[PDB]
Amino acid sequence: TLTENKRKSMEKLSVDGVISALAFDQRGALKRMMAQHQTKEPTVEQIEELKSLVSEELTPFASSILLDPEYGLPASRVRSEEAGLLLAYEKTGYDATTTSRLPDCLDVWSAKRIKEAGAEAVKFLLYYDIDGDQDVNEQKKAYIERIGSECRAEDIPFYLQILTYDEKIADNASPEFAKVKAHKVNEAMKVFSKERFGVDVLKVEVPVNMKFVEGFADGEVLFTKEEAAQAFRDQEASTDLPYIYLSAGVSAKLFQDTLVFAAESGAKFNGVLCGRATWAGSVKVYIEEGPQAAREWLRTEGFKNIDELNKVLDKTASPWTEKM
């Protein structure tokens, strides 16, 4: 199930078997945010500095941090010594002119190099449509096998992130996609839980768009609480691997309500990958007010944000040590 070194790495990424990972491997996305508050093009120096500030100030309150090798290596070196490190292995984005969204590793990186850079885990993002072109998915499955094999050889945990989509639906925030999301998410988890892919932890979406669930919905309601709850139980039944939720797309408050709903429904999720919901406010402050201002924001609102999340995690998350 786990080797000695994989186990020690998992322990370093976790606290009492729960993963509270701070996500900051954003690259193009972060540049765009920064680009909001200044005229000049955001610089390499600024991106590297902001990542270092967030890492330095908030990793004492996180079990681990996810960074990118492109801008995040300086930040990784100033993380809390008690915090583990995950490094992203994939190139960002996808070709919007096609529907295949094929995976591609960073050109001058390898699992070995990620380990050599001091990571306790390899993170890789895969876009997957279970109902998509079968040859496309065969290529995707082959690619993940390679990465899973690399990680076994280098004896470093493999964190596979799955973002689902539909080749025929442009907007994943649409009601049309919400109706099939549980299917997309849970069936993908079933595929990638197979031993052949070498995954140690799955980083996945919640199997429902909570914005369409009764009580959580501001607008149209597509699902009852009981229907949403069943999707979470179906997800829990879709894998025996540790899995953690990504907070991408929703507010901090909604994500936290979702963790509660997940736990109450019977999901035994083992933590979260949360980023933007925690450090977003530091970006404008850093750009408009500079480095020191960001530190004080991070020591105050930043701590409050991640502290609130941790308190929610305490009463909702299950330790991965109960899956081993």
Q: Which does 257 bind (CB under 5 to 8 A by kind): Ca ion, a second copy, none?
A: Ca ion
Q: Beta strands 121-128 and 271-274: pairing type?
A: unpaired
By beta-carbon proximity to Ca ion, the closer residue of 133 and 289 is 289
By beta-carbon proximity to a second copy, the closer residue of 101 and 211 is 101
Q: Which does 99 bind (CB under 5 to 8 A by kind): Ca ion, a second copy, none?
A: none
* Residue 237 interacts with a second copy (CB under 8 A): yes or no: no
Rounded to whole angstroms, how far apart are CA atoms 80 and 74? Answer: 13
Can you name the residues that pair with 164 across neighbouring β-strands? 128
* Residue 112 interacts with a second copy (CB under 8 A): yes or no: yes
Beta-carbon count within 10 A of 146 CB: 14
Beta-carbon count within 10 A of 111 CB: 25
User: Which residues ranging from 125 to 184 are in contact with a second copy (CB under 8 A)?
Assistant: 135, 138-139, 142-143, 145-146, 149-154
How far lies 248's CA from each of 24, 40, 196, 278, in Å? 12, 28, 28, 11
Q: Which does 193 bind (CB under 5 to 8 A by kind): Ca ion, a second copy, none?
A: none
CA atoms within 13 A on the CB side of 281: 17
Shortest distance, position 200 Cβ to a second copy, whole Å: 13
Query: Please, what sign has the CA dihedral across residues 9, 10, 15, 21?
Result: positive
Shortest distance, position 11 Cβ to Ca ion, whole Å: 4
By beta-carbon proximity to Ca ion, the closer residue of 163 and 259 is 259
By CB under 8 A, name the one of 196, 253, 299, 304 that touches a second copy. Answer: 196
Three-state secondary structure call for residue 32: helix
| Rg (alpha carbons) of the chain, rounded to whole number | 19
User: Which residues ranging from 252 to 281 are in contact with Ca ion (CB under 5 A)?
Assistant: 257
Q: Which does 11 bind (CB under 5 to 8 A by kind): a second copy, Ca ion, none?
A: Ca ion
User: Which residues contact a second copy (rule: CB under 8 A)?
Assistant: 105, 107-113, 135, 138-139, 142-143, 145-146, 149-154, 196, 198
